[PDB]
Amino acid sequence: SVLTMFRYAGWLDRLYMLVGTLAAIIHGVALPLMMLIFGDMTDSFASVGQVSKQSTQMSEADKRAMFAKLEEEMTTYAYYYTGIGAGVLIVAYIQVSFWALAAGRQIHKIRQKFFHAIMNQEIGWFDVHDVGELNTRLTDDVSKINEGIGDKIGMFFQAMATFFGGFIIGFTRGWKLTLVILAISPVLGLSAGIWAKILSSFTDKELHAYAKAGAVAEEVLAAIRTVIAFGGQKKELERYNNNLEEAKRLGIKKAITANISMGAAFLLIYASYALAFWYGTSLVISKEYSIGQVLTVFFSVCIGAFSVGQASPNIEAFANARGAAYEVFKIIDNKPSIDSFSKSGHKPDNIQGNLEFKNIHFSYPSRKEVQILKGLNLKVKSGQTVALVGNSGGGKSTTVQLMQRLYDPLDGMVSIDGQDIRTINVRYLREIIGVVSQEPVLFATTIAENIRYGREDVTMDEIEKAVKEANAYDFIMKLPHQFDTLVGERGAQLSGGQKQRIAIARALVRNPKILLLDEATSALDTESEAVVQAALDKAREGRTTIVIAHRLSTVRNADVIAGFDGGVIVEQGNHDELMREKGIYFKLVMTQEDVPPASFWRILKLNSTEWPYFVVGIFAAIINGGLQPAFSVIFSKVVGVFTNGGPPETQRQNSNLFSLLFLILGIISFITFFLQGFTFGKAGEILTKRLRYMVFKSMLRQDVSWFDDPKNTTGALTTRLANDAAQVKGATGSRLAVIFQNIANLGTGIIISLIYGWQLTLLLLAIVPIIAIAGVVEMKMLSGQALKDKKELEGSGKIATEAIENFRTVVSLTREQKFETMYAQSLQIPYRNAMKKAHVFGITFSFTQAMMYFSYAAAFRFGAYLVTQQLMTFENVLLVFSAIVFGAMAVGQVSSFAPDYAKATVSASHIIRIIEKTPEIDSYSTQGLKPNMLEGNVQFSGVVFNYPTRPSIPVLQGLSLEVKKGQTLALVGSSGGGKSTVVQLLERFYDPMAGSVFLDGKEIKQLNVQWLRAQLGIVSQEPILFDRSIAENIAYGDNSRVVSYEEIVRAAKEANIHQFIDSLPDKYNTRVGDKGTQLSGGQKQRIAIARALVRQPHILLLDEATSALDTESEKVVQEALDKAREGRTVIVIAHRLSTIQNADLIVVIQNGKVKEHGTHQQLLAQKGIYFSMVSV
């Protein structure tokens, strides 16, 4: 389970990682070979050169000779170092490039496999789980795995190789002593293991919190219109904030525990240093060990221990990857019972559909206590039409879902031609099914592509034939871009009837043997319904149909009608047989970018409130970062005091003071490392929480037209927020802390060299530009593709989210493979850029390391000229060189910061742009008139409006209408005529191009936006709920006020939904599904009606609030509204005749214009359009 990742390596990734590990081992061993010349060899000649120099030895004749000898040996070692520089160049690329190449390939396969696993789950699995977390897992956790399985493992292996090189060199030069030094290595190993395990657990919890935050964001952004209409921005921001607070506290805990562990680790390592130094002093005083021997072993083990210490961020990244892999591979390992990707099962050649439901018992997985079907029995013969009639929630849509095997029955059997559908192949079974759902859902693509999801290889002639049969041909040809016009998310940029007709055509192109039509004409007008019904009846002979309808005209011509009661069929037979049996059908019928370079810095300004955390951390960065180079200087005293120590007692005292100093340095290192990690980590967590909060608030501030933009889809927005926050976080925190430490390491070197040797400091002037340019050029590349990589990423996150939100449609259309192919295609450009980065970062790291070895060689050469010319002491040369190597050991980590900084800068620029964005219709604005009283007069005067996504099409052409308090306005007309546009404009979702809208004679642009929307109670054409309880969904109707239980129950009673909630276990605490899919269509609509009514609004806007209701439920809701007619102004959009005649005034809208206005009797008196609609 620990090594559950690397599952998809394969032979190529296994060889990329074997060869890279060998290259890392060679690169690591290159550094103890550097130390091999110290202590002895070069330093054997040195403590021989001046400490053991003769006071005078014909120095005028032979000191020049040993200086030349040391000139000659230094030149040889300079050649050796140039060779090592070339070798390190080669091995450093292979290490870094191959490791990132393998990480990139594995991450590509992991993303594909995780998406495939999500697409393989059952409908019940989606019902039980909160799938809004899945896109956050796709974007955040996979990137967390990527940073722990890549070149960081190569760096860890290089550090381990350097440590082992010091290990062998110490034992070769002198054992028993390096045993004392390295006997504490198991303690550090256990400490690192515990550290990593705690980091992994904290990462798992933090990713859970971030996934919950992403689920909240996805739910809110998907239903943004409902949030805006009901003024829910503050509360949704608050739920998002609660998840962010959980993530922030987890991150702070992680930082504290990790840093206290690391500080204890360094306290232990310096205590070990002190004990080892005492032991070495004892040995060297005993004369068992020469001073050079202890020098060599100490220095060799010291560099290896320093490499191990610098390896810690790699272990942290590996632990974070392990913490991230948990949920991803848990989902990947899940196996569904109803497998749609299985190749098993029967595929009959010729099917003459004989549908049978025998003794069907079903309870939904998420509400298993509730029985929906109790021994349901139904038979459908080939070529026959069955009409399922009954009250809302009876289980008709449940039967439709069971027919396509979205769930298995608890008891009983669903059979085709006497064969159990469990034994049939799932994909084959669902491919011969054409289905139109109760509330059709489209995809964010073109009309032609939406229809092509029904059948992939359908030609344009068959698409035209289907849209002619679906009565969608005319409006498609009328609008520009023809079939290539792109519909909104879920088809939101079409009218309800247009979307329904598109879904009908999508079902028709399948050429299905079995057609399920769950209220396929709910959003249609009378003429469209009639023509679509004629088209369907034209081809009823070769196919079996199960139709659900609340319109009696469609049920009239059905071959057989089945009535639902108590979960069973009570009446089945012919229309005349049903009239004669006087059943339930009897009662039913009599009820007739710029990317500014300073952007990242600006983001850091947003963290300025945490300035005291930074300064302390900066100090903690200056001290310990300056300690590693200064470790040389004091160590120069360590030998220097000992060599001139003289008597054994004086040397013993000096060495025990040195050991005490080492212990003090360990205490200081514990303190400073804990502070440097903790302060920067806490500042980073605070910054990330603040940035996420601000970005979500800005997104909730934006206009409706902004969400209508094709770039601003729900998946794109969620991916944008998560990715920008993560990329900015990548450059802040402990990462920035270690960068500051490394900068201190590199910085103290200049000063200490300047005191000790100034000429050699000129090399830093020659060494730093050459590295620096190598840094900036990569800056230009990794930035340029990052702007692309994010954009493409926003595409991929779109495809996944559209697939996860619309999963039931995808499964019904058998389009899991198509969406997987699109998701794989959207990953191509990022995957190629990941392969390009491997070589680019491999080359850069390789060049930087060579340059260090090349500078080392130059220093040794430069050093000799100085010594052969008596310009500097050799001891000073060695001290300066040790300073340079200790300072430069962190240059690799500094260069590794380049990929993070560019991504952070780009994401910072995007975050700054989104926060500063100001909408045209600002919902957060406190400006605007708030009238003391509201009379309820609504007027439209010459309103002309074009939707921003399709500005060439005029939707409203001088629309004018009036409605007063106590009056009911009934907007009727054909589909797509602009009825919902009026309600959207009254909510100030958009502003009209011309004309005006008045509320009590005051133009609504002058009014406060929130105040204006608070006077409105809206029921949208296709209502959307939240993944919350019924009580919370109703109480959403009046935010900024705590709605009591009594008011919620009263609203539910007014909406005729109270009885269903009360009978339901958990009652008002029953969690509804995502967007209300775990309810009946009529139940969800009634919940929406209760949500609008609990507000008690002055203007009630009902956009077909009774489309999915029963006749009895419609009657109850209508009488409830009638009892509260006076005292409010009501605007009603309805295709039902019975809801229109009681309205005070009726407006017929065609082509954005009023054609007929007046009462029911007046419109019936003249033989106009209204009479035509009535007669049909």
Ligand X SMILES: Nc1ncnc2c1ncn2[C@@H]1O[C@H](COP(=O)(O)OP(=O)(O)OP(=O)(O)O)[C@@H](O)[C@H]1O
Residues near ligand Y01 (CB under 6 A) are 3, 6-7, 9, 12, 14-15, 17, 19, 75, 78-79, 82, 90, 94, 101, 105, 152-153, 156, 314-315, 318, 763, 766-767, 770, 835, 851, 854-855, 857-858, 861-862, 864-865
Maximum pairwise Cα distance, the chain: 136
Residue number, 367 or 1160, with CB nearest to ligand X: 367
- The helix/strand/coil state of 970 is strand
Sorted by sequence, the CB contacts under 8 Å of residue 1090 that are 6+ apart come out as 1034, 1037, 1048, 1051, 1052, 1054, 1055, 1057
Residue number, 156 or 674, with CB nearest to ligand Y01: 156
Using CB under 5 A as the binding rule, whether residue 617 contacts Mg ion is answered as no
Residue 1131 phi/psi, 5-degree rounding, is -115, 125
Residue number, 730 or 976, with CB nearest to ligand X: 976
Q: 12 contacts which partner out of ligand Y01, Mg ion, ligand X, none, CB within 5 to 8 A by kind?
A: ligand Y01
**Interface of this chain with Mg ion, residues 783 to 842, rule: CB under 5 A:** none
Q: 708 contacts which partner out of ligand Y01, Mg ion, ligand X, none, CB within 5 to 8 A by kind?
A: ligand X
Sorted by sequence, the CB contacts under 8 Å of residue 484 that are 6+ apart come out as 446, 447, 448
CA–chain centroid gap for 882, Å, is: 47
Residue number, 89 or 414, with CB nearest to ligand X: 414
What is the C-alpha to C-alpha distance for residues 1171 and 1154, in angstroms, rounded to an integer? 16
Residue number, 498 or 855, with CB nearest to ligand X: 498
Residue number, 603 or 864, with CB nearest to ligand Y01: 864
What is the C-alpha to C-alpha distance for residues 147 and 145, in angstroms, rounded to an integer? 6
Residue number, 936 or 1081, with CB nearest to Mg ion: 1081
- The helix/strand/coil state of 3 is coil
The minimum distance between CB 961 and Mg ion, in angstroms, equals: 16
The string of DSSP letters for 946-964 reads --TTSTTS-SEEEEEEEE-
The minimum distance between CB 987 and Mg ion, in angstroms, equals: 14
Residue number, 524 or 1116, with CB nearest to Mg ion: 524
The minimum distance between CB 22 and ligand Y01, in angstroms, equals: 8
Residue number, 121 or 1080, with CB nearest to Mg ion: 1080
Residue number, 307 or 397, with CB nearest to Mg ion: 397
How many residues are there in the chain? Answer: 1176
Helices (H), 421-491: 426-431, 447-452, 460-469, 473-478
Strand ranges for 103-247 from DSSP E: none
Handedness of CA 474, 478, 484, 485 (dihedral sign): negative
Residue number, 81 or 707, with CB nearest to ligand Y01: 81
Of 1111, 492, 1035, 1017, which Cα lies nearest the Cα of 806?
492
1145-1150 and 1153-1158 beta bridge pairing: antiparallel
Q: 75 contacts which partner out of ligand Y01, ligand X, Mg ion, none, CB within 5 to 8 A by kind?
A: ligand Y01
The minimum distance between CB 394 and Mg ion, in angstroms, equals: 9
CA–chain centroid gap for 818, Å, is: 22
- The helix/strand/coil state of 243 is helix
What is the C-alpha to C-alpha distance for residues 1102 and 1117, in angstroms, rounded to an integer? 12
Using CB under 5 A as the binding rule, whether residue 984 contacts Mg ion is answered as no
Give the DSSP H or E segment for 643: helix 611-643
Residue number, 494 or 884, with CB nearest to ligand X: 494
The minimum distance between CB 857 and ligand Y01, in angstroms, equals: 4
Q: 156 contacts which partner out of ligand Y01, ligand X, Mg ion, none, CB within 5 to 8 A by kind?
A: ligand Y01
Residue number, 865 or 1171, with CB nearest to ligand Y01: 865
Burial (0-12, 13-18, 19+ Cβ within 10 Å), 333: exposed
The minimum distance between CB 396 and Mg ion, in angstroms, equals: 6
| Per-position x/- string for 1068-1107, each x denoting binding to Mg ion as judged by CB under 5 A, each - no binding | -------------x--------------------------
CA–chain centroid gap for 1084, Å, is: 29
Q: Which stretch binds Mg ion (CB under 5 A): 63-71, 389-397, 578-586, 722-730?
A: 389-397
Residue number, 547 or 1094, with CB nearest to ligand X: 547
The minimum distance between CB 988 and ligand Y01, in angstroms, equals: 50
What is the C-alpha to C-alpha distance for residues 1149 and 158, in angstroms, rounded to an integer? 75
Burial (0-12, 13-18, 19+ Cβ within 10 Å), 605: exposed
Q: Are 506 and 444 in contact (CB under 8 A)?
A: no
Alpha carbon of 241 to those of 139, 213, 484, 694, 870: distances in Å?
A: 20, 8, 40, 10, 68
The minimum distance between CB 2 and ligand Y01, in angstroms, equals: 8
The minimum distance between CB 37 and ligand Y01, in angstroms, equals: 15
Q: 153 contacts which partner out of Mg ion, ligand Y01, ligand X, none, CB within 5 to 8 A by kind?
A: ligand Y01
Side-chain-facing half-sphere of 699: CA atoms under 13 Å: 31
The minimum distance between CB 438 and ligand X, in angstroms, equals: 6
Q: 1079 contacts which partner out of ligand Y01, ligand X, Mg ion, none, CB within 5 to 8 A by kind?
A: ligand X
Q: 523 contacts which partner out of ligand X, Mg ion, ligand Y01, none, CB within 5 to 8 A by kind?
A: ligand X
The minimum distance between CB 7 and ligand Y01, in angstroms, equals: 5
Using CB under 5 A as the binding rule, whether residue 438 contacts Mg ion is answered as yes
Q: Are 910 and 860 in contact (CB under 8 A)?
A: no
Provide the β-strand partners of residue 413.
Answer: 358
The string of DSSP letters for 97-142 reads HHHHHHHHHHHHHHHHHHHHHHHHS-HHHHHHS-GGGHHHIIIIIH
What is the C-alpha to C-alpha distance for residues 937 and 1060, in angstroms, rounded to an integer? 36
Q: 978 contacts which partner out of Mg ion, ligand Y01, ligand X, none, CB within 5 to 8 A by kind?
A: ligand X
Token reading at 906: 């780009």
The minimum distance between CB 840 and ligand Y01, in angstroms, equals: 12
Size of the site for Mg ion (CB under 5 A): 7
Q: 120 contacts which partner out of ligand X, Mg ion, ligand Y01, none, CB within 5 to 8 A by kind?
A: none
Q: 15 contacts which partner out of Mg ion, ligand Y01, ligand X, none, CB within 5 to 8 A by kind?
A: ligand Y01
Q: Looking up tokens 């309103």, which residue turns up? A: 943
The minimum distance between CB 1116 and ligand X, in angstroms, equals: 14
Q: Are 391 and 568 in contact (CB under 8 A)?
A: no
Residue number, 647 or 769, with CB nearest to ligand Y01: 769
| Per-position x/- string for 953-982, each x denoting binding to Mg ion as judged by CB under 5 A, each - no binding | ---------------------------x--
- The helix/strand/coil state of 407 is coil
Residue number, 188 or 504, with CB nearest to ligand Y01: 188
Q: 488 contacts which partner out of Mg ion, ligand X, ligand Y01, none, CB within 5 to 8 A by kind?
A: ligand X
| Per-position x/- string for 459-498, each x denoting binding to Mg ion as judged by CB under 5 A, each - no binding | ------------------------------------xx--
Residue number, 808 or 837, with CB nearest to ligand X: 808
Task: For 519-572, give the secondary structure using H, E and C.
Answer: CCCCCCCHHHHHHHHHHHHHCCCCCEEEEECCCHHHHHCCCEEEEEECCEEEEE
Q: 307 contacts which partner out of ligand Y01, Mg ion, ligand X, none, CB within 5 to 8 A by kind?
A: none
The minimum distance between CB 550 and ligand Y01, in angstroms, equals: 53
Point out which residues bind ligand X (CB under 6 A): 127, 364, 366-367, 372, 392-398, 438, 488, 492-498, 523, 708, 947, 949-950, 955, 973, 975-981, 1021, 1073, 1077-1083, 1108
Footprint of Mg ion (CB under 5 A): 397, 438, 495-496, 980, 1021, 1081
